[PDB]
Symmetry: none
Subunit: 126 residues, 2 copies
């Protein structure tokens, strides 16, 4: 096919990125809590700068849409990022590394990765 | 991701005989054989009341999920516990002491430790 189950399993093998509970039919969800916002906050209320990605399946095509931003206390992602070079670089390194592994996994599945049209406004190289 | 899986494994192993390396992919596995079920049984078929814990990684965050139960003759953990105050108290004491070390290790690693949402159904204080 390959099966949704096959995809889920192979994507989970990339590492601690896929969030299975937020995946449904033909849509997969990945994220990365890359940098803590403020460690003075109690652990359970801490927030993180990072990225999240939505992967739509369209037959043998997987269509990717990454956003950079903020993961708040509720587990909501917001498209706002601290304007610090070092933090942005850290987010970008985790994203690039992930995308490289994703490329490899999709190639092994004999499928193809393609950017969402909204990636034209993505503010980092990829 | 930094720190690495390898570094986390070694750091967690330093806490004591809890982590089970052969059961750790983007998840770490810990357990504790707190109370022997019946000492009259030979050491081959011995079973234990205790706990096990799955620690998930997402970036700088580590997410813990403890369960209390029975480590059976087959080497499988089951979420059932003998309904005895003294046994439950002993399990609980091992768990709290372990958790205190885990908290200190995660802090040393400069990461954030938070309960899994399923810990809302954990039947003991933590």
């Amino acid at each position: 096919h390959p099966t949704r189950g096959k995809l889920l399993k192979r994507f989970a093998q990339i590492g601690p990125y896929i969030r299975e509970q937020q995946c449904q039919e033909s849509q997969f969800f990945f994220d990365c809590l890359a940098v803590c916002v403020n460690k003075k906050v109690t652990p359970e209320k801490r927030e993180f700068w990072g990225w999240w990605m939505e992967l739509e399946r369209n037959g043998e095509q997987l269509i990717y849409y990454y956003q950079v931003g903020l993961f708040d206390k509720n587990g909501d992602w917001v498209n706002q990022v601290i304007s610090k070079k070092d933090v942005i670089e850290s987010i970008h390194e985790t994203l690039i590394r992930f995308h490289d592994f994703l490329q490899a996994a999709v190639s092994e599945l004999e499928m193809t990765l393609v950017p969402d049209e909204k990636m034209s406004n993505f503010p980092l190289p990829l």
